[model samples]
Target: GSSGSSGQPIKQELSCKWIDEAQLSRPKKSCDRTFSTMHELVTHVTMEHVGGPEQNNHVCYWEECPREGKSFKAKYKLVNHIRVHTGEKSGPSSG
Candidate 1:
């Protein structure tokens, strides 16, 4: 019976929309990334939002970050910055 038998709710999809104004603009540009759970979204944001190895300064360019454009001086510091996005606190510390 497809009538009100199921007590579960519908699954909602999550997505991310980005527009790098610093890059060249396109009239029909599209960024279609999807995530089913928070973990996936956080992982995606951490890996993709964070700059790649080409970025040597180890600084975080995550949007709305307080230390944007400021170098972390060490990889651990950069990890801390990423924790802000993941809500991870009370882990390893750098001297």
Candidate 2:
């Protein structure tokens, strides 16, 4: 389990509360950073987060995606992978 931002790693239930693809425009890191407490976190999530066609466009997240669109999780990973393809650093660019 996560130690509330500063506790050492502890073994506990392994589960992920994933948000849907609708909210792809906003990064997960951004969303997670916004919510602190559990109550606020749960309420902050909703399927409405799904992104429109204009947001995701032609991105494919998996080998079996069949181009049927993707979730925020998939899209976020795809964006990160693109940096690798372009020989860009994983961190923010200085220029």
Candidate 3:
């Protein structure tokens, strides 16, 4: 009844072992995060794996805005805005 019963199949399972939480070296914060669904995994990847929008990374460059205290609504927005500050100045002449 328990073993043979048709229940939710173990599909879309994600293994967190691959993530290098130790690289951050913060045991307390790393262990506190868990992903039970695809959305959760995406959120975790956005916030942790890719770091926050305010982080000083490549994504912030296209945003044309200093990431000192900024947060992007989406990943693509971060990429687009950073481009403005990265010497790809846009006005009306440049595509």
* Preferred candidate (lDDT higher): 1 or 3: 1
- Give the per-residue lDDT digits (tens) of candidate 3, residues 1-95: 35665678766543232223234664423223444564554444445545665655423311123563264666555534433432333333332
Model 2, backbone clash pairs (residues 3+ apart or across chains), number: 6
**Candidate 2: misplaced stretches above 4 Å?**
1-53, 56-72, 91-95
Answer with 1 or 2, whichever has the higher TM-score. Answer: 1
Q: Residue 73 of candidate 2: its Cα lDDT?
A: 50
Q: TM-score: which candidate is best?
A: 1
Against the hidden true structure, what lDDT does model 3 obtain?
0.42
Cα error, candidate 2, residue 32 (Å): 36
* Per-residue alpha-carbon lDDT of candidate 2 for residues 8-94, written as tens digits (9 for 90 to 100): 665442122332344557553222224334333222221113233345343432222333344235434444433332233562432
Q: Which parts of model 3 are misplaced by more than 4 Å? A: 1-6, 16-34, 58-95
> lDDT for every model?
0.53, 0.35, 0.42
How big is the positional error of residue 40 in model 1, measured in Å on the Cα after superposition?
2.1
Error of 2 at 86 (Å): 0.4
TM-score of 2: 0.23
Stretches of candidate 1 off by over 4 Å are 1-4, 7-34, 51-55, 86-95
Candidate 1: minimum summed lDDT over ten consecutive residues — where? 14-23
Q: How many clashes in candidate 1?
A: 0
Best by lDDT: 1
